[PDB]
């Protein structure tokens, strides 16, 4: 069956970095017979920045599709996306299979360069193709290049299996190769690779009989497999893909970062988010890590806003950044204190002998960042992204200009989560295990165990 003439990229969370956009643009330009599509999630995205991004992509002739609008976001995927710190690797691993089932075509990571265009028609014997090449290595297994015909059954089976793998993530034991991988690569990377990544894929392909007994995790031996599953039906290096030695991959999902706007949400909003996520865990597995949710919820970074002028309503204990009326004018940063007083954050004009404190000053670094904005009246999505990032993490030496970020402790939050969950009679009855290391809550987990 013919591979549908679509090239699919995924970027969820904040806005796709410039480097990645350049890569996508190159793929689009070099493969004009294919529709190039960037997939996003509008539900967690920063709305203003995403709007700018979409308009930009339209101007470059790149289609943007939303995972929710197209119906490719399973509940399990929504579940990871709505976490306060999503594993975007897991999300992307799951989404690519659902997109391919729905539309067919070619999934690519945006950290692979195009060294040759695809054939105008690709005909796949089993409606499904993998690359023997990944991250500059030949005769390997990876999941960053996947081709199929719309509605392919292998792709559909993989999508179902990865959903089950993900749902079972908190029962995942670091054994076999993963015991080692935990030690070498760390817990986050090991678990990702095993649950949704090339580890998951390896085991699923073996179960399906697509890889035979001669194939091993770290020695796939494509030359001993059915090469009709491979692009161009061969283990030979494909012409299409290139990476330089000094950047074989981006590992962009590895940092654990809060999703957009967490720091600006109300406690009650965040709490209810956690409650719904826990409810899903309980319904699907009967098991939830209470500490995961509590340890996320306790984090309060700086609240912030970028506006044209004093917002119709001020947020107490936050930063408010005001753009100039003209492209030449200076920005104004305010610390909005707990009583909603605008405290202007300013710096003296310095020259002559350089003070080593001032070069290392958070506020001067911030000021420098603002000065490099091309058009203060019309900042780009990436500019807004960088300024927001700076504001979230800004820690002035002046206590008068420092956000207080007064917030509940993890244990108190966990107690509240426990009460709300266990007060639901249906949920209570569905709990089989609860992971907690909170001293006040271990007892309550024992109490329910008796019941
Ligand atoms: O903030 C992020 C980081 C990563 N990703 C997704 O994660 C995929 C894999 O990232 P990367 O290629 O950097 O990982 P690596 O190939 O090094 O494992 C990307 O293509 C995106 O779909 C995402 O959506 N948002
Ligand atoms: Mg990659």
UniProtKB/Swiss-Prot annotation:
EC number from the UniProt entry: 2.4.1.-
Sorted alphabetically, the keyword list is: Glycosyltransferase, Secreted, Transferase, Ubl conjugation, Virulence
What is the protein's given name? Subversion of eukaryotic traffic protein A
Domain description = Multidomain protein with an N-terminal glucosyltransferase domain and a C-terminal phosphatidylinositol 3-phosphate-binding domain, which guides the Legionella effector to the surface of the Legionella-containing vacuole. Both domains are essential for the cellular effects on the eukaryotic host.
Q: What does this protein do?
A: Secreted effector that interferes with vesicular trafficking of host cells. Possesses glucohydrolase and mono-O-glucosyltransferase activity by using UDP-glucose as a sugar donor substrate. Is able to glucosylate histones H4 and H3.1 in vitro, but it is unlikely that histones are the natural substrates for SetA. May glycosylate a component of the host cell vesicle trafficking machinery during L.pneumophila infection.
In its UniProt record, a GO molecular function of this protein is:
mannosyltransferase activity
Organism this protein belongs to? Legionella pneumophila subsp. pneumophila (strain Philadelphia 1 / ATCC 33152 / DSM 7513)
Induction per the UniProt record: Is induced in the post-exponential phase of growth.
GO cellular component labels: extracellular region; membrane
Subcellular locations according to the entry: Secreted
| Region entry Glucosyltransferase, spans | 1-375
The annotated consequence of gene deletion is: Cells lacking this gene grow similarly to wild-type L.pneumophila in both murine bone marrow-derived macrophages and the soil amoeba Dictyostelium discoideum, indicating that SetA is not required for efficient intracellular replication of L.pneumophila in host cells under laboratory growth conditions.
**PTM statement from Swiss-Prot or TrEMBL:** Ubiquitinated and polyubiquitinated when ectopically produced in both yeast and mammalian cells; however it is unsure if this modification occurs during the L.pneumophila infection of host cells.
UniProt miscellaneous comment: Production of SetA in yeast is extremely toxic, it causes a severe growth defect and alters yeast cell morphology. When expressed in mammalian cells, SetA causes cell retractation.
GO terms, biological process = mannosyl-inositol phosphorylceramide biosynthetic process
KW Amino-acid biosynthesis (keyword) present: no
Keyword match NADP: no
């Amino acid at each position: 069956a013919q591979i549908d003439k679509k090239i699919h990229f995924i970027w969820v969370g904040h806005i796709m970095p410039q480097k990645n956009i350049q890569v996508v643009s190159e793929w689009a330009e070099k493969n004009p017979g294919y529709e190039t599509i960037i997939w996003v999630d509008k539900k967690i995205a920063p709305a203003k920045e995403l709007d700018l991004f979409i308009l930009d992509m339209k101007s470059k002739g790149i289609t943007v599709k939303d995972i929710n609008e197209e119906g490719v976001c399973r509940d399990s995927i929504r579940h990871e996306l709505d976490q306060e710190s999503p594993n975007y690797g897991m999300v992307s691993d799951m989404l690519r299979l659902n997109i391919l089932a729905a539309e067919g075509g070619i999934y690519l990571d945006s950290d692979i360069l195009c060294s040759a265009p695809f054939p105008d028609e690709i005909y796949a014997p089993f409606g499904f193709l993998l690359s023997p090449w990944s991250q500059g290595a030949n005769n390997t297994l990876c999941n960053d290049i996947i081709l199929c015909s719309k509605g392919n059954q292998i792709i559909q089976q993989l999508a179902d299996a990865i959903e089950q793998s993900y749902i079972a993530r908190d029962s995942f034991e670091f054994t076999h190769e993963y015991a080692s991988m935990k030690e070498t690569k760390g817990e986050r990377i090991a678990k990702t690779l095993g649950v949704t990544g090339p580890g998951f894929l390896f085991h699923q392909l073996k179960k399906m009989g697509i890889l035979n007994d001669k194939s091993e995790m770290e020695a796939i031996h494509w030359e001993l497999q059915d090469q009709r599953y491979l692009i161009d039906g061969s283990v030979k290096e494909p012409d299409y893909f290139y990476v330089p030695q000094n950047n074989t991959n981006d590992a962009s999902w590895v940092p654990s970062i809060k999703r957009p706007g967490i720091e600006n949400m109300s406690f009650q909003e965040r709490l209810e988010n956690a409650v719904q996520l826990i409810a899903f865990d309980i319904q699907k597995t009967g098991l939830f890590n209470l500490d995961h949710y509590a340890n996320e919820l306790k984090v309060k970074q700086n609240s912030w806003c970028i506006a044209a002028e004093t917002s119709p309503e001020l947020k107490p204990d936050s930063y408010l950044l005001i753009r100039p009326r003209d492209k030449t004018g200076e920005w104004t940063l305010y610390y909005v204190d707990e009583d909603k007083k605008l405290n202007p954050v300013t710096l003296p004009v310095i020259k002559g002998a350089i003070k080593l404190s001032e070069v290392s000053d958070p506020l001067r670094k911030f000021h420098t960042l603002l000065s490099q904005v091309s058009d203060p009246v019309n900042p780009t999505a990436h500019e807004l992204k960088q300024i927001g990032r700076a504001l979230i993490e800004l820690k002035p030496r002046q206590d008068e200009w420092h956000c207080k970020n007064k917030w509940s402790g993890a244990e108190e939050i966990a107690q509240e989560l426990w009460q709300r969950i266990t007060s639901n009679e249906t949920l209570r009855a569905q709990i089989k295990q609860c992971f907690t290391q909170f001293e006040s809550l271990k007892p309550r987990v024992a109490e329910l165990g008796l019941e």
